[PDB]
Amino acid sequence: GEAPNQALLRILKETEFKKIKVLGSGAFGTVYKGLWIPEGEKVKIPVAIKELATSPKANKEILDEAYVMASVDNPHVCRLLGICLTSTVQLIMQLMPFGCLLDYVREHKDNIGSQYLLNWCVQIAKGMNYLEDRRLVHRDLAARNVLVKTPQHVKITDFGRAKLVPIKWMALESILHRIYTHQSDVWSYGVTVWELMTFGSKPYDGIPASEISSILEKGERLPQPPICTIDVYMIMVKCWMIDADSRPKFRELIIEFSKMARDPQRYLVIQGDERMHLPSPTDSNFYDMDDVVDADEYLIP
Numbered sequence: 580g581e582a583p584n585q586a587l588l589r590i591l592k593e594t595e596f597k598k599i600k601v602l603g604s605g606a607f608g609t610v611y612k613g614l615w616i617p618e619g620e621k622v623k624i625p626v627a628i629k630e631l632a633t634s635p636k637a638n639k640e641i642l643d644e645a646y647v648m649a650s651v652d653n654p655h656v657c658r659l660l661g662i663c664l665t666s667t668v669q670l671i672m673q674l675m676p677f678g679c680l681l682d683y684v685r686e687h688k689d690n691i692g693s694q695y696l697l698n699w700c701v702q703i704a705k706g707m708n709y710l711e712d713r714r715l716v717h718r719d720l721a722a723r724n725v726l727v728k729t730p731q732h733v734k735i736t737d738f739g740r741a742k743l744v745p746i747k748w749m750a751l752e753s754i755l756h757r758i759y760t761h762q763s764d765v766w767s768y769g770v771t772v773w774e775l776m777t778f779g780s781k782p783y784d785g786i787p788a789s790e791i792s793s794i795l796e797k798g799e800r801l802p803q804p805p806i807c808t809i810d811v812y813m814i815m816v817k818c819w820m821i822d823a824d825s826r827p828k829f830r831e832l833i834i835e836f837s838k839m840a841r842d843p844q845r846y847l848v849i850q851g852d853e854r855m856h857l858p859s860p861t862d863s864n865f866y867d868m869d870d871v872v873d874a875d876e877y878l879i880p
């Protein structure tokens with residue numbers, strides 16, 4: 580029927596890695612900043628360790644996420660580095676030093692220009708088009724689930740809902756009939772773009788989740804962000820059509836945003852644009868430090 584999933588689930592020893600500090604704590608559990616020094620490899624890989632109370636059902640949920648996360652390999656998608664079989668069960672992931680895009684745009688508004696915004700859109704569309712190739716429906720795309728490796732490199736994450744509720748990011752078919760397609764992820768992509776273009780605003784702020792279904796049914800949509808030209812807003816609007824097949828395809832979104840990213844100032848109007856600066860790996864003290872290699876450069880055992 581379908582193609583066999585030959586992905587390798589890597590089991591890592593507790594002694595092979597160390598927890599440095601806590602990066603975040605939520606519904607899932609706690610994420611730690613860590614270092615992974617494999618076997619006798621003379622490498623130090625900066626990692627993020629996701630950790631869970633212990634219950635059999637919670638372990639199933641974390642192992643389902645590990646399954647999906649180990650099954651992906653794309654420059655714009657977060658891959659699972661391995662798992663550690665403690666009583667708790669820990670997921671070892673790539674350290675994304677700048678955290679989530681949502682908090683990033685909120686904290687750096689005064690230094691984010693049209694080039695970065697448009698490049699981010701291209702990058703998310705690429706990651707999403709890859710998930711579509713792998714026949715994978717995300718079911719939770721949002722600016723909080725896009726992580727920042729460097730200000731110039733972002734990746735899609737959170738496969739806790741990914742298959743083969745976040746109302747304000749969902750397509751109408753999903754809210755009304757629990758239908759989830761790749762075109763339903765396109766609706767979520769539209770909202771994510773709106774979150775970036777507004778510098779991290781909350782979609783439909785003050786409006787309760789039960790009112791959203793009616794609001795969308797009537798024909799109401801998220802407003803035009805002040806920096807958006809009709810060109811960019813038209814794209815957002817198309818991702819929010821009632822007819823799923825009328826919405827753009829991710830491959831088309833790559834093309835559309837790429838054309839626009841070649842002339843950013845023509846599509847986004849930002850006060851003091853281009854005079855803006857963000858940390859680049861060509862900056863002083865951007866990075867013991869000896870033998871530190873990024874996960875993207877550390878391949879196989």
Ligand SMILES: Cc1nc2cnc(Nc3ccnc(N4CC[C@@](C)(C(N)=O)C4)n3)cc2n1C(C)C
Pocket residue numbers: 602603604607610626627629657672673674675676677678679723724726736737
């Ligand atoms: C503040 C912060 N700094 C981070 C550095 N690196 C990662 N690394 C990764 C890589 C892939 N996936 C994830 N996780 C974080 C928790 C997750 C379940 C989610 N909802 O974003 C996916 N973290 C996550 C980081 N965070 C989280 C808590 C948003």
